[PDB]
Protein backbone atom coordinates (compact mmCIF):
# COMPACT_ATOMS: atom_id res chain seq x y z
CA UNK A 1 0.00 0.00 0.00
CA UNK A 2 1.67 2.97 -1.13
CA UNK A 3 3.60 1.23 -4.25
CA UNK A 4 6.81 2.61 -6.54
CA UNK A 5 6.85 2.22 -10.39
CA UNK A 6 7.98 -1.01 -10.67
CA UNK A 7 5.62 -2.85 -8.27
CA UNK A 8 3.04 -0.34 -10.37
CA UNK A 9 4.12 -2.57 -13.67
CA UNK A 10 3.98 -5.78 -11.27
CA UNK A 11 0.29 -4.48 -10.36
CA UNK A 12 -0.53 -4.12 -14.31
CA UNK A 13 0.46 -7.35 -15.09
CA UNK A 14 -1.03 -9.13 -12.17
CA UNK A 15 -4.48 -7.61 -13.07
CA UNK A 16 -4.18 -8.37 -16.89
CA UNK A 17 -3.68 -11.94 -15.90
CA UNK A 18 -6.40 -12.20 -13.31
CA UNK A 19 -8.26 -11.00 -16.45
CA UNK A 20 -7.33 -13.66 -18.57
CA UNK A 21 -8.07 -16.35 -16.29
CA UNK A 22 -11.34 -15.14 -15.42
CA UNK A 23 -12.32 -13.16 -18.87
CA UNK A 24 -15.61 -16.09 -19.42
CA UNK A 25 -15.30 -16.20 -22.85
CA UNK A 26 -12.38 -15.70 -25.12
CA UNK A 27 -12.01 -12.77 -27.24
CA UNK A 28 -10.60 -14.41 -30.50
CA UNK A 29 -13.68 -17.17 -30.19
CA UNK A 30 -16.51 -13.82 -29.67
CA UNK A 31 -14.88 -12.24 -32.47
CA UNK A 32 -15.32 -15.84 -34.61
CA UNK A 33 -18.43 -16.22 -33.77
CA UNK A 34 -19.37 -13.01 -35.17
CA UNK A 35 -20.26 -14.66 -38.37
CA UNK A 36 -22.97 -17.13 -36.42
CA UNK A 37 -26.33 -14.54 -36.28
CA UNK A 38 -30.09 -16.07 -35.37
CA UNK A 39 -32.23 -16.59 -38.37
CA UNK A 40 -35.91 -14.85 -38.39
CA UNK A 41 -37.49 -17.87 -37.28
CA UNK A 42 -34.81 -18.49 -33.97
CA UNK A 43 -35.51 -14.53 -33.29
CA UNK A 44 -39.39 -15.10 -33.26
CA UNK A 45 -38.87 -18.39 -31.06
CA UNK A 46 -37.34 -15.81 -28.39
CA UNK A 47 -39.51 -13.53 -28.86
CA UNK A 48 -42.90 -15.89 -28.33
CA UNK A 49 -41.02 -17.18 -24.55
CA UNK A 50 -42.75 -15.98 -21.54
CA UNK A 51 -40.99 -12.92 -19.75
CA UNK A 52 -40.76 -15.38 -17.28
CA UNK A 53 -39.24 -17.69 -19.13
CA UNK A 54 -36.50 -15.37 -20.73
CA UNK A 55 -35.66 -13.51 -17.18
CA UNK A 56 -34.93 -17.14 -15.96
CA UNK A 57 -32.40 -17.85 -19.16
CA UNK A 58 -31.27 -13.91 -18.68
CA UNK A 59 -30.58 -14.70 -14.89
CA UNK A 60 -29.02 -17.46 -15.50
CA UNK A 61 -26.77 -15.91 -17.96
CA UNK A 62 -26.08 -12.79 -15.73
CA UNK A 63 -25.10 -15.01 -12.53
CA UNK A 64 -22.62 -16.64 -14.23
CA UNK A 65 -20.95 -13.58 -15.36
CA UNK A 66 -21.14 -12.15 -11.74
CA UNK A 67 -19.40 -14.87 -10.77
CA UNK A 68 -16.30 -14.37 -12.96
CA UNK A 69 -16.59 -10.92 -11.94
CA UNK A 70 -16.07 -12.03 -8.50
CA UNK A 71 -13.23 -14.11 -9.66
CA UNK A 72 -11.53 -11.19 -10.74
CA UNK A 73 -11.59 -9.55 -7.98
CA UNK A 74 -10.67 -12.26 -5.45
CA UNK A 75 -7.44 -12.59 -7.59
CA UNK A 76 -6.79 -8.78 -7.58
CA UNK A 77 -3.85 -7.66 -5.21
CA UNK A 78 -5.10 -6.54 -2.00
CA UNK A 79 -8.95 -7.14 -2.39
CA UNK A 80 -8.85 -10.58 -0.22
CA UNK A 81 -6.81 -8.27 2.51
CA UNK A 82 -9.50 -6.12 2.69
CA UNK A 83 -12.38 -6.91 5.42
CA UNK A 84 -15.35 -9.24 4.23
CA UNK A 85 -17.97 -6.18 4.16
CA UNK A 86 -15.74 -3.90 2.18
CA UNK A 87 -15.48 -7.14 -0.62
CA UNK A 88 -19.04 -7.33 -0.10
CA UNK A 89 -19.68 -3.38 -0.35
CA UNK A 90 -17.28 -3.27 -3.28
CA UNK A 91 -18.58 -6.54 -5.31
CA UNK A 92 -22.71 -5.92 -4.62
CA UNK A 93 -21.84 -1.97 -6.09
CA UNK A 94 -19.72 -2.90 -9.09
CA UNK A 95 -20.31 -6.72 -10.47
CA UNK A 96 -23.22 -5.54 -12.68
CA UNK A 97 -21.18 -2.68 -14.16
CA UNK A 98 -18.25 -4.57 -14.89
CA UNK A 99 -20.24 -7.55 -16.30
CA UNK A 100 -22.17 -4.32 -18.68
CA UNK A 101 -18.29 -2.91 -19.79
CA UNK A 102 -17.28 -6.77 -19.91
CA UNK A 103 -20.15 -7.37 -22.25
CA UNK A 104 -18.76 -4.66 -24.85
CA UNK A 105 -16.52 -7.56 -26.25
CA UNK A 106 -19.44 -9.58 -27.27
CA UNK A 107 -21.43 -6.64 -28.72
CA UNK A 108 -20.66 -5.75 -32.80
CA UNK A 109 -21.15 -2.38 -33.80
CA UNK A 110 -21.58 -3.48 -37.79
CA UNK A 111 -24.66 -5.07 -37.20
CA UNK A 112 -25.83 -4.28 -33.54
CA UNK A 113 -25.68 -7.69 -32.16
CA UNK A 114 -24.91 -9.07 -28.61
CA UNK A 115 -23.75 -12.91 -27.95
CA UNK A 116 -26.38 -14.48 -27.00
CA UNK A 117 -26.96 -18.43 -25.73
CA UNK A 118 -24.56 -19.15 -28.89
CA UNK A 119 -25.52 -16.92 -31.50
CA UNK A 120 -25.28 -13.12 -32.21
CA UNK A 121 -29.13 -11.03 -31.79
CA UNK A 122 -29.77 -7.70 -32.06
CA UNK A 123 -32.26 -6.56 -29.22
CA UNK A 124 -35.40 -7.29 -30.74
CA UNK A 125 -34.38 -11.09 -29.14
CA UNK A 126 -35.55 -9.60 -25.75
CA UNK A 127 -38.83 -8.08 -27.08
CA UNK A 128 -40.86 -10.39 -24.46
CA UNK A 129 -39.39 -9.21 -21.35
CA UNK A 130 -41.08 -5.57 -21.90
CA UNK A 131 -38.25 -3.26 -21.30
CA UNK A 132 -37.21 -1.38 -24.75
CA UNK A 133 -35.87 1.47 -23.16
CA UNK A 134 -33.53 -0.94 -20.87
CA UNK A 135 -32.46 -2.80 -23.71
CA UNK A 136 -31.95 -0.08 -26.28
CA UNK A 137 -29.79 1.52 -23.13
CA UNK A 138 -27.63 -1.59 -22.85
CA UNK A 139 -26.48 -1.95 -27.19
CA UNK A 140 -26.09 2.54 -26.93
CA UNK A 141 -23.57 1.78 -24.06
CA UNK A 142 -21.90 -1.18 -25.53
CA UNK A 143 -22.18 1.05 -28.74
CA UNK A 144 -19.96 3.81 -27.68
CA UNK A 145 -17.56 1.43 -25.65
CA UNK A 146 -16.99 -0.47 -28.78
CA UNK A 147 -16.27 2.36 -30.83
CA UNK A 148 -13.08 3.30 -28.26
CA UNK A 149 -11.60 -0.04 -29.81
CA UNK A 150 -11.40 -1.31 -26.20
CA UNK A 151 -7.71 -3.68 -25.94
CA UNK A 152 -8.35 -6.77 -23.17
CA UNK A 153 -5.73 -4.98 -21.14
CA UNK A 154 -7.56 -1.51 -20.95
CA UNK A 155 -10.61 -3.36 -19.59
CA UNK A 156 -8.82 -5.71 -17.15
CA UNK A 157 -7.35 -2.00 -15.80
CA UNK A 158 -10.74 -0.47 -16.22
CA UNK A 159 -13.14 -2.74 -14.42
CA UNK A 160 -10.43 -3.44 -11.60
CA UNK A 161 -11.08 0.64 -11.23
CA UNK A 162 -14.86 0.44 -11.83
CA UNK A 163 -14.89 -2.15 -8.51
CA UNK A 164 -12.09 -0.58 -6.50
CA UNK A 165 -14.11 2.75 -5.64
CA UNK A 166 -13.17 4.40 -2.37
CA UNK A 167 -16.92 6.20 -2.55
CA UNK A 168 -19.04 2.91 -2.48
CA UNK A 169 -21.25 3.99 0.82
CA UNK A 170 -20.76 1.52 3.51
CA UNK A 171 -17.48 1.02 3.42
CA UNK A 172 -15.34 0.50 6.95
CA UNK A 173 -11.92 0.92 6.04
CA UNK A 174 -12.48 3.42 3.18
CA UNK A 175 -8.28 4.45 3.72
CA UNK A 176 -7.31 0.49 2.50
CA UNK A 177 -9.85 0.90 -0.56
CA UNK A 178 -8.27 3.99 -1.40
CA UNK A 179 -4.68 3.12 -1.49
CA UNK A 180 -5.89 0.05 -3.64
CA UNK A 181 -7.87 2.42 -6.14
CA UNK A 182 -4.62 5.10 -6.19
CA UNK A 183 -2.35 2.68 -7.09
CA UNK A 184 -4.67 0.86 -9.89
CA UNK A 185 -5.49 4.30 -11.48
CA UNK A 186 -1.65 4.87 -11.59
CA UNK A 187 -1.35 1.57 -13.09
CA UNK A 188 -4.18 2.15 -15.52
CA UNK A 189 -2.66 5.81 -16.76
CA UNK A 190 0.90 4.13 -16.42
CA UNK A 191 0.19 1.38 -19.14
CA UNK A 192 -2.00 3.95 -21.37
CA UNK A 193 1.23 5.69 -21.75
CA UNK A 194 3.57 2.13 -22.02
CA UNK A 195 0.77 1.72 -25.67
CA UNK A 196 0.27 5.19 -26.54
CA UNK A 197 -3.22 5.18 -25.38
CA UNK A 198 -3.84 8.59 -23.65
CA UNK A 199 -6.14 9.17 -26.03
CA UNK A 200 -8.93 6.71 -24.76
CA UNK A 201 -9.34 8.78 -20.91
CA UNK A 202 -11.24 11.53 -22.34
CA UNK A 203 -13.23 9.26 -24.67
CA UNK A 204 -14.46 6.90 -21.71
CA UNK A 205 -17.81 6.63 -20.42
CA UNK A 206 -18.44 9.86 -17.88
CA UNK A 207 -18.94 10.15 -14.12
CA UNK A 208 -22.50 8.64 -13.15
CA UNK A 209 -23.11 6.80 -16.66
CA UNK A 210 -22.19 3.63 -15.30
CA UNK A 211 -24.00 4.03 -12.22
CA UNK A 212 -27.62 5.44 -14.13
CA UNK A 213 -27.33 2.43 -16.03
CA UNK A 214 -27.20 0.32 -12.32
CA UNK A 215 -26.51 -3.17 -6.83
CA UNK A 216 -26.59 -6.93 -6.61
CA UNK A 217 -27.92 -8.23 -3.04
CA UNK A 218 -25.46 -8.77 0.06
CA UNK A 219 -26.53 -12.57 -0.06
CA UNK A 220 -26.12 -13.35 -3.59
CA UNK A 221 -22.51 -11.64 -3.52
CA UNK A 222 -21.54 -13.12 -0.53
CA UNK A 223 -22.58 -16.47 -2.24
CA UNK A 224 -20.58 -16.10 -5.19
CA UNK A 225 -17.60 -14.88 -3.15
CA UNK A 226 -18.01 -18.03 -0.12
CA UNK A 227 -19.43 -20.67 -2.27
CA UNK A 228 -18.12 -23.39 0.42
CA UNK A 229 -17.11 -22.89 3.68
C1 LIG B 1 -19.55 -10.79 -19.91
C2 LIG B 1 -18.25 -11.52 -20.21
S1 LIG B 1 -18.06 -12.22 -21.84
O1 LIG B 1 -17.19 -13.37 -21.69
O2 LIG B 1 -17.77 -11.12 -22.74
C3 LIG B 1 -19.63 -12.93 -22.31
C4 LIG B 1 -20.48 -12.22 -23.11
C5 LIG B 1 -21.68 -12.76 -23.49
C6 LIG B 1 -22.04 -14.03 -23.06
C7 LIG B 1 -23.37 -14.59 -23.44
C8 LIG B 1 -24.40 -13.91 -22.57
O3 LIG B 1 -24.51 -14.18 -21.39
N1 LIG B 1 -25.11 -12.96 -23.25
C9 LIG B 1 -26.05 -12.16 -22.63
C10 LIG B 1 -26.56 -11.01 -23.17
C11 LIG B 1 -27.52 -10.36 -22.35
C12 LIG B 1 -28.14 -9.09 -22.68
C13 LIG B 1 -27.47 -8.31 -23.61
C14 LIG B 1 -27.99 -7.09 -23.98
C15 LIG B 1 -29.17 -6.69 -23.39
N2 LIG B 1 -29.84 -7.42 -22.49
C16 LIG B 1 -29.32 -8.61 -22.14
O4 LIG B 1 -29.98 -9.38 -21.17
C17 LIG B 1 -31.11 -8.68 -20.64
C18 LIG B 1 -30.80 -7.85 -19.43
C19 LIG B 1 -31.86 -7.48 -18.63
C20 LIG B 1 -31.65 -6.70 -17.51
C21 LIG B 1 -30.36 -6.29 -17.22
C22 LIG B 1 -30.13 -5.47 -16.02
O5 LIG B 1 -29.73 -5.93 -14.96
O6 LIG B 1 -30.45 -4.19 -16.33
C23 LIG B 1 -29.30 -3.36 -16.15
C24 LIG B 1 -29.29 -6.64 -18.01
C25 LIG B 1 -29.52 -7.42 -19.12
C26 LIG B 1 -27.71 -11.06 -21.18
S2 LIG B 1 -26.76 -12.50 -21.08
C27 LIG B 1 -21.19 -14.74 -22.23
C28 LIG B 1 -19.97 -14.20 -21.87
Known amino acids: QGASLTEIEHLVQSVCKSYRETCQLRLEDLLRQRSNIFSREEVTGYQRKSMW ?45 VVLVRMC ?10 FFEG ?21 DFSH ?10 EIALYTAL ?7 PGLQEK ?10 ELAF ?5 KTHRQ ?22 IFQHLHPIV
Request: charged share 25%; with cysteine.
Open 199 to 220: SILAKLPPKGKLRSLCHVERLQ
Open 144 to 153: SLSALHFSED
Open 162 to 168: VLINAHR
Open 105 to 114: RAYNADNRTV
Open 53 to 97: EMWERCAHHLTEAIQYVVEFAKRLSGFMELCQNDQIVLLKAGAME
Open 189 to 193: HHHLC
Open 175 to 184: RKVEQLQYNL
Open 119 to 139: KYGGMELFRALGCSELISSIF
